[PDB]
Amino acid sequence: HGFVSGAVVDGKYYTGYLVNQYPYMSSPPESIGWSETATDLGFVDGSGYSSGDIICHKSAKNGAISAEIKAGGKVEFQWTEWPESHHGPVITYMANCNGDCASVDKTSLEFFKIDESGLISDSNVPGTWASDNLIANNNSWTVTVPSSIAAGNYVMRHEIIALHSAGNQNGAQNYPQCINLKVTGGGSDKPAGTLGTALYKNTDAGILVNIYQSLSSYDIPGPALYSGH
């Protein structure tokens, strides 16, 4: 249980969608963070993987503004205090808005993976995951916008999948958080994108998984990190 309170985009801090505050305001500030209604700080599980909720979290609506970033620049995601029990991968996507991300139909967004991390060390079951690195780094995660992607407006979908109940069907807990980026400079790479509602199935190797028995390998779920980049 947690959410992204902010993002440092090419060195500039942007306040995210404060899901514990903005939903209760007469009129919340604009944010690069998408609004969403998981006001319990909860998750989308496998029962929701073909639902619109998996795209940018429960009933998500477009952030009204975007953060400019030179292609090649970094995004640092700031989470709330992530519970140690919520072991799992940290997966980050971009999708071209093909226009303004403020008015894109979230169900049209074609997500390509730009960063992924899973099981770091198996030594002491259930081991050290991306999510434990995130905790250790003051509950934050840094990714690169590839220097070679095409300039354009993109939703960056940042996600922790907690695997502590993933032993059972629909037990994995997805915590997607979307921000709006305006990528400048760049190259011409247009990686193959996947609809939010096609990213995961509840049978996937990295979704239906028992982290409490030693894993020889972990198969980070979702489409392939585009090898070009």
Ligand SMILES: [Cu+2]
């Ligand atoms: Cu939780």
